[PDB]
Amino acid sequence: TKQHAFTREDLLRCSRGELFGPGNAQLPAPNMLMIDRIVHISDVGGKYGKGELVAELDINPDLWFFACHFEGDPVMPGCLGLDAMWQLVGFYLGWQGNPGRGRALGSGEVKFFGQVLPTAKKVTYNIHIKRTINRSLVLAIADGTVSVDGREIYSAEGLRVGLFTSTDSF
Amino acid sequence: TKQHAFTREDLLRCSRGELFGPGNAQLPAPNMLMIDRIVHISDVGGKYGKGELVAELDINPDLWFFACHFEGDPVMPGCLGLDAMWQLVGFYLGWQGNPGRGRALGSGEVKFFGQVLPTAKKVTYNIHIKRTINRSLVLAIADGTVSVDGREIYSAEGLRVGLFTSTDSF
Numbered sequence: 001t002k003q004h005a006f007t008r009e010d011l012l013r014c015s016r017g018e019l020f021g022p023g024n025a026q027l028p029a030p031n032m033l034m035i036d037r038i039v040h041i042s043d044v045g046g047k048y049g050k051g052e053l054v055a056e057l058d059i060n061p062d063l064w065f066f067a068c069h070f071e072g073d074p075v076m077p078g079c080l081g082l083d084a085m086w087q088l089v090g091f092y093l094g095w096q097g098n099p100g101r102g103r104a105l106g107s108g109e110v111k112f113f114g115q116v117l118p119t120a121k122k123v124t125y126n127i128h129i130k131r132t133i134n135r136s137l138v139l140a141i142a143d144g145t146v147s148v149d150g151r152e153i154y155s156a157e158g159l160r161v162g163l164f165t166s167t168d169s170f
Numbered sequence: 171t172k173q174h175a176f177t178r179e180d181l182l183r184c185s186r187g188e189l190f191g192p193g194n195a196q197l198p199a200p201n202m203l204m205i206d207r208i209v210h211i212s213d214v215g216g217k218y219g220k221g222e223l224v225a226e227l228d229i230n231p232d233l234w235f236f237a238c239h240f241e242g243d244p245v246m247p248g249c250l251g252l253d254a255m256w257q258l259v260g261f262y263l264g265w266q267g268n269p270g271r272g273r274a275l276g277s278g279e280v281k282f283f284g285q286v287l288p289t290a291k292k293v294t295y296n297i298h299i300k301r302t303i304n305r306s307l308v309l310a311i312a313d314g315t316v317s318v319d320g321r322e323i324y325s326a327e328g329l330r331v332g333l334f335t336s337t338d339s340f
Contacts, residue, residue, distance in 0.1 A: 015238075015240070015241065016241060017240075017241060017242060022242065026240040026241065026242075026243065027240075028238050028239040028240055028247070029237075029238040029239075029240075029241055030238060031201070031234070031238060032235060032238045032239040032247060033238070064201070065202060067199075068185075068198050068199040068200060068201060068202045068203070069198040069199075069202040070185070070187075070196040070197075070198055070199075070271070070272075071185065071186060071187060071196065071199055072187060072192065072196075073196065073271050075273070077198070077202060077253060077274075078253075078256070078273070078274040078276075079249040079250065079252055079253035079256065079274065080249065082249055082252070083247060083248075083249035086248070086249065101240070101243050102240075103245070103248070103282065103285065104247075104248040104249065104282050105281070105282050105283070106248075106279065106280040106281040106282050107277075107279075107280050108278070108279060109276065109277075109278060110276040110277050110280065111275070111276040112273065112274050112275050112276050113275070114340060115273065115340050170284060170285050
């Protein structure tokens with residue numbers, strides 16, 4: 001709960017296991033990392049009063065996914081915008097100080113109603129934590145939106161991420 | 171509708187735009203391509219009698235995503251298994267002979283209840299086409315499952331993919 005904003009280097013340290021410690025939640029490293037910075041994280045406020053993340057990814061034409069997706073028709077894969085939202089819910093669980101490795105467990109409704117072209121400047125993620133559950137397994141449920149240069153393009157309801165300790169097979 | 175099975179080289183040709191022709195549905199090229207072969211495609215049968223795809227991805231420890239996702243905790247990203255299902259619904263629309271570029275439009279419920287470790291041999295995708303709509307925009311709705319070495323690990327209900335012609339902005 002210590003720090004409310006993170007630079008790219010903080011997130012790279014997170015990807016190495018050196019922010020929350022080994023066996024705790026990690027962001028992916030490049031090229032699966034879909035966040036450059038966390039501008040805001042809190043365990044209060046948001047849509048549901050249970051916390052909020054705001055994160056950014058800078059866009060330039062040379063990001064790896066534009067060349068292979070698709071040849072002659074470059075567009076950020078919707079699945080990687082969705083994954084950024086799972087990455088941020090996983091980061092949230094680690095940031096609260098829960099132990100274990102992050103796995104995406106799924107979502108309710110996902111909608112893609114716009115696209116990220118290689119001419120865009122910035123993707124913004126808004127995550128609203130709905131509920132955390134501290135049963136047998138620790139998990140978070142959230143709603144998220146993806147925006148490009150001010151404009152909402154994706155939504156996900158009921159994003160679920162779970163934490164798996166050293167004894168938890170999956 | 172011409173060919174009911176595809177080799178990796180067929181899918182690489184598809185990724186270049188040379189299977190369905192330029193401006194029609196393309197698979198992504200590596201490293202976003204999540205299919206090695208289509209074992210079965212048909213416009214009849216399946217769960218809903220509206221068609222079926224069965225596709226495979228061979229697993230080895232050196233696939234790019236294992237190193238970055240995560241360091242010390244390798245696991246295939248759920249988002250890329252989900253994306254394979256969107257890739258296959260897009261391929262289906264192109265295979266029926268519809269014109270335009272593929273975009274994922276979203277899904278209903280997605281569940282991840284297992285994982286692909288770098289010790290696995292083979293991921294299998296089963297896609298059941300539910301409905302195609304030939305309005306203003308052409309789109310397909312499908313259910314899908316991801317299995318690793320016989321074992322079901324992911325499900326998606328209401329996968330939606332749409333086709334966008336040369337005049338269609340998104």
